[PDB]
Design a protein around this ligand. Structure first.
Ligand SMILES: [Zn+2]
Ligand SMILES: [Zn+2]
Lengths: 72, 169
């Protein structure tokens, strides 16, 4: 995923929380999905994914540790 | 197909029959420590949740990540189940392995009515998790401001409380 500084459409919304972005806001693009920095995080610990690596379970994204503890 | 799947899917008759056999352990967790009650709460299976509680299921059981059924009901926005768990004395400020309480998840996932219900029942808004984040600070701004206001009117102290437990220091 990549860090972007938002200057896009006013219709653009966060994939996680559905909220909008402000001009020049530092956001994250992961596989074409846009996120607030506080939203591109593990659903269980709310922390950034180490090395950007996440694992999906039923529509939510998890860090390795939490995926292994709960779902693997 | 086992008890865990029946609880996830809401197969109430199967769950009832399984519970009828007292040789079965209604508290026993699956491979990741999810008890029948964890699964029923997570998936919104109200009738199964009530059955398990009334037949004596332990309310504060923890899975592998130390989530309780209340954490799961709150995270997935199951308002009636949250109320039922609270009625039967679930620990409203139960902490998981990250020091997150149910309110953290209600806030993070914008489960506004669950979040408000939690605060109405005394859920602490100012208690940091292990990484210094208070539950209300996981919410979007409207909800965040609201819950602090509601907490204040409920006689909470709004001073930030750094995480502590018996093994922390
Ligand atoms: Zn967001
Ligand atoms: Zn995590």
């Amino acid at each position: 995923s990549e860090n972007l500084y938002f200057q896009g459409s006013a219709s653009a919304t966060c994939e996680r929380c559905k909220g909008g972005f402000a001009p020049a806001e530092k956001i994250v693009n992961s596989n074409g999905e846009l996120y607030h920095e506080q939203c591109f995080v593990c659903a269980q610990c709310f922390q950034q994914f180490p090395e950007g690596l996440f694992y999906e379970f039923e529509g939510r994204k998890y860090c390795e540790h939490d995926f292994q503890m709960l779902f693997a | 197909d086992d008890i865990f799947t029946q609880c996830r899917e809401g197969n109430a008759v199967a769950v009832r029959l399984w519970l009828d056999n007292t040789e079965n352990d209604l508290n026993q967790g699956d491979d990741h420590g999810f008890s029948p009650l964890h699964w029923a709460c997570r998936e919104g299976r109200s009738a199964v949740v009530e059955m398990l509680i009334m037949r004596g299921a332990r309310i504060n059981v923890m899975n592998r990540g130390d989530d309780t059924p209340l954490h799961l009901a709150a995270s997935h926005g199951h308002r009636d189940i949250v109320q039922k768990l609270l009625q039967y004395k679930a620990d409203i400020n139960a902490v998981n392995e990250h020091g997150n309480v149910p309110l953290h998840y209600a806030c993070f996932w914008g489960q506004d009515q669950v979040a408000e219900d939690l605060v109405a029942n005394g859920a602490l808004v100012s208690i940091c998790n292990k990484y210094g984040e208070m539950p209300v600070d996981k919410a979007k701004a409207p909800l965040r401001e609201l819950l602090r206001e509601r907490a204040e009117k409920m006689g909470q102290n709004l001073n930030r409380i750094p995480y502590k437990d018996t093994f922390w220091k």
